[PDB]
């Protein structure tokens, strides 16, 4: 029963291993093994549930174990394993073949097979752990082993993509352990984790690997947000080491998602408004990407309210995600109408929902945006309006309070008006008629630049996928 | 079946003239008993859930209707199933003779045509659409193909189907060659005009409703006074003052409606007050029309008060171009408008750039801004140009 179960899944694993083994042996091809590893995550996740855990036991017995003898026993100890007589030395799939990792030349140490075998061995370990959701000692045991192993290897061009997906599980398993239980050792463990990310990122700068630095920057920028150091994130993004060429669309959307949150506290919403929009277009619309589109759209609605301009309300009702957008619907209504008591009562009941995403602190500063937007609305109504009539519509305190708020927004060019005290009304200084000025000409220049940029980007990849058609013999 | 859907909607939510619910409830009870539809007597329970003026009294004592019992029972249900099983026995007896004969493609399709009418009159929706697809492929010409669309449009107007009905609507239109066919024109312009209602297109609504071939009046779906009802409502948006004195006021089809149906009054009180641009007479006719037109109609009351905001926007633009500087108290004693409530009425437009009115709060006078310029027109190209570049970058990066 259990004998035929281990031979079926192991044969499917070796079949996928021999495909990427011959591709890296001849010259250097990094494109083909990368496309297979994309589907490997989905095929292995479903396969780990079937045929239990016994598919990975004979794989370690097959190939030679540099470090991997005692690591599988520690993984099988937590599950209280019953003895099936799985002791190594029973099943032998090598049988002295060149593609089978010939044993005599391997045992004599005349050839080194450990490079591709050991780096691939650590990949299947983190996949089974993420399926069973194992924590505590098993998480710390892997972090201690992997770090010296990556420092010993020279990390060639093909070797940089093997551990590129392993760093994601290092930071993921550390955050799930802290949120599950808080202790004194969780803080000291994060100190070493910060130094490990920076040492490997600096080494990857010489190799100039596109996917390696893409996964690290996404994990490092998120670490600064949890640890709460802004000065580290400000200088980190100033170097601009993130390549835009071969990185995946899923990795690009995560990059622009962090820049919108960093610039949110810098009081510059001009550049932050573009990063949150570009992150939506780069993120897929599929079901697995719904988790990112849910959090990204919650930030976009908050940025527009911080800009003093009411965004388009059609995004809430037309989308199918409005169930989670209900708290943000009443926030825009309170800022637009300018009701003072409605805004205070909205953030009070929904404070629990806004605590998880940490957007409640930004809602505290929306209290100012309620009045600043209302002043902009009433200013665009009538060019000449009395001073005391403003306090009657918004139910303000006195005329001395509104006098400062109108002259406050004109510093950034918001209201664009003047207050006449001797006359008794506030006259708007905006006559429009910009058709005679040069201001629209500056915007028209940047629009054509976007056209010539896409034309050059159209030339980036055109003939490239067709380059292999001429060299390969056709009919 | 126009009164079937009309009286059923009057029992949903009615805030004006609750006496109409009695004639509506007594009609739907006597209509279902005289027809073969089983489930439409049962649908009264689910369709009226969570609505003002509940027509059902079981656990909810807040029902304001005159007839408070729509409750479904097995006494009427069993009687309607007997008429359904007795009729299908006669049709299956004829269909069995047609299957053994199989004379031409018309008799083979007529078997499904009798079913397409049967499954539509027994209360089946998806089961009727499956029978209409068989008769569509067996039709010998376009004459039997459009009759399939008539049943599709019948079940689509009751359940508000904007997808399957709209797709089959343009399918009969395109086909191979359209031509000047009366059936593919008169019926299409009326039905497609009804689909433009719910989505509020207003571009084709004025052309396909205010302008009709003659009377329409199929009596099966919508009636004569209904087409003229939506014509007065939709004719106040796209049609400007040039067409109001031609296809509205001077239209010969609307001249005999005043002396025929006096319950509408949307082609006289609304048209004369707007053509004369008199706010004094135009104001009291808003609520009189809102009660007897927008509320009873199914495709109107869904929006309702939004139309009041849009219809009042038209008269504000008529007066704005008639003067530059005017006092606020001048229109108060003349057109009968409240000065204190005037700022709140105009406050829903001016900040949204819907109107150019500017009122001075010092001396209490209203001014006029520039109605049109080159700068305001280029702003539409900015939003249209930036919205277009999104698809170029989205579809450009998706294909690689």
């Amino acid at each position: 029963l259990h004998h035929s179960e281990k031979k079926y899944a192991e044969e499917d694993q070796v079949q996928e291993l021999l495909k990427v083994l011959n591709e890296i042996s001849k010259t250097t091809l990094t494109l083909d093994p990368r496309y297979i590893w994309r589907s490997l995550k989905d095929l292995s996740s479903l396969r780990n549930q079937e045929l239990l855990n016994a598919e990975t036991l004979c794989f370690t017995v097959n190939v030679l174990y540099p470090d991997s003898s005692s690591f599988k026993k520690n993984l099988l100890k937590f599950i209280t394993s019953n003895h099936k007589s799985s002791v190594p030395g029973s099943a032998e799939l090598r049988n002295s073949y060149p593609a089978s990792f010939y044993s005599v030349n391997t045992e004599k140490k005349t050839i080194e097979v450990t490079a591709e075998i050991n780096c691939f061995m650590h990949l299947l370990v983190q996949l089974f752990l993420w399926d069973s959701k194992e924590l505590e000692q098993l998480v710390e045991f892997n972090r201690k082993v992997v770090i010296p192993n990556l420092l010993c290897y020279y990390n060639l061009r093909s070797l940089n993509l093997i551990n590129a997906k392993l760093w994601f599980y290092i930071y993921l398993s550390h955050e799930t352990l802290a949120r599950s239980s808080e202790e004194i050792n969780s803080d000291n463990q994060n100190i070493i984790l910060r130094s490990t990310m920076m040492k490997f990122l600096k080494i990857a700068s010489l190799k100039h690997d596109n996917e390696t630095k893409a996964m690290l920057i996404n994990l490092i920028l998120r670490d600064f947000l949890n640890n709460g150091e802004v000065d580290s994130a400000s200088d980190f993004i100033s170097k601009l080491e993130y390549p835009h060429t071969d990185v995946s669309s899923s990795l690009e959307a995560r990059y622009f998602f962090y820049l919108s949150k960093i610039n949110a506290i810098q009081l510059d919403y001009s550049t932050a408004n573009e990063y949150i929009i570009a992150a939506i277009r780069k993120a897929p619309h599929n079901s697995k990407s719904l988790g990112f589109l849910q959090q990204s759209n919650k930030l976009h609605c908050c940025i527009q309210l911080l800009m003093g301009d009411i965004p388009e309300l059609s995004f809430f009702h037309q989308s199918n995600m409005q169930k989670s957008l209900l708290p943000y619907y009443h926030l825009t209504k309170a800022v637009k109408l300018g009701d003072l008591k409605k805004f205070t009562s909205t953030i009070t009941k929904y404070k629990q929902l806004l605590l998880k995403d940490d957007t409640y602190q930004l809602c505290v500063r929306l209290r100012s945006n309620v009045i600043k937007t209302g002043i902009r609305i009433i200013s665009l109504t009538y060019k000449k309006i009395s001073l005391r009539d403003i306090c009657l519509k918004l139910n303000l305190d006195s005329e001395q309070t509104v006098e400062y708020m109108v002259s406050r927004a004109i510093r950034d060019g918001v209201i664009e008006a003047k207050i006449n005290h001797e006359d008794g009304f506030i006259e708007t200084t905006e006559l429009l008629n910009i058709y005679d000025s040069e201001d629209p000409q500056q915007v028209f220049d940047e629009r054509i630049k976007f056209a010539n940029q896409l034309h050059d980007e159209y030339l980036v990849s055109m003939r490239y996928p067709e380059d292999k058609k001429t060299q390969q013999n056709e009919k | 079946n126009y009164e079937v859907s009309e009286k059923a909607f009057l029992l949903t939510q009615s805030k004006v003239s609750i006496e109409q619910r009695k004639e509506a409830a007594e009609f739907v009870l006597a209509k279902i008993k005289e027809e073969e539809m089983a489930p439409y007597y049962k649908y009264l329970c689910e369709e009226y859930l969570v609505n003002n003026g509940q027509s059902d009294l079981e656990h909810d004592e807040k029902s304001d209707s005159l007839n408070e019992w729509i409750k479904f029972d097995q006494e009427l249900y069993n009687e309607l199933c007997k008429k359904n099983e007795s009729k299908i026995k006669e049709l299956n007896e004829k269909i069995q003779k047609l299957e053994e004969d199989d004379e031409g493609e018309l008799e083979q399709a007529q078997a499904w045509i009798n079913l397409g009418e049967y499954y539509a009159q027994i209360g089946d929706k998806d089961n009727a659409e499956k029978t209409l697809g068989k008769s569509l492929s067996k039709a010998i010409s376009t004459g039997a193909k459009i009759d399939v669309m008539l049943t599709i449009a019948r079940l689509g107007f009751f359940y508000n189907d904007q997808l399957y009905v709209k797709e089959k609507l343009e399918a009969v239109n395109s086909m191979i060659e359209k031509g000047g066919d009366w059936e593919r024109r008169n019926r299409y312009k009326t039905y497609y005009g009804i689909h433009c209602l719910a989505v509020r297109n207003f571009k084709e609504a004025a052309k396909l409703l205010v302008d009709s071939l003659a009377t329409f009046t199929s009596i099966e779906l919508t009636s004569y006074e209904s087409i003229a009802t939506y014509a007065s409502v939709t004719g106040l948006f796209t049609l400007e003052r040039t067409d109001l004195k031609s296809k509205v006021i001077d239209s010969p089809e609307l001249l005999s409606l005043i002396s025929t149906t006096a319950a509408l009054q949307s082609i006289s009180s609304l048209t004369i007050s707007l053509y004369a641009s008199d706010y004094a007479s135009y104001f009291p006719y808003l609520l009189e029309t809102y009660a007897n037109v927008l509320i009873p109609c199914k495709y109107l009351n869904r929006h309702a008060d939004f139309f009041v905001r849009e219809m009042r926007r038209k008269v504000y633009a008529q007066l704005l171009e008639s003067y530059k500087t005017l006092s606020l108290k001048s229109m108060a004693s003349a057109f009968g408008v409240s000065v204190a409530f005037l700022d709140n009425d105009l406050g829903k437009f001016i900040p949204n750039k819907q109107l150019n009115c500017v009122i001075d709060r010092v001396n209490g006078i209203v001014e006029t801004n520039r109605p049109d310029n080159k700068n305001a027109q280029y702003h539409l190209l900015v939003k249209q140009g930036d919205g277009l570049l999104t698809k170029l970058q989205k579809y450009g990066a998706a294909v690689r």
Binding site: - | F283, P284, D305, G336, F341, K348
Partner: peptide, 27 residues
């Protein structure tokens, strides 16, 4: 639809008749 296409106003509905009443009384 959104903005004022749905919420509209929800105020001054039945109070429109009170505007003509106060004009014919306080006059």
């Amino acid at each position: 639809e959104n903005w004022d296409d749905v919420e509209v106003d929800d105020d001054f509905t039945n109070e429109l008749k009170a505007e003509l009443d106060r004009y014919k009384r306080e006059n």
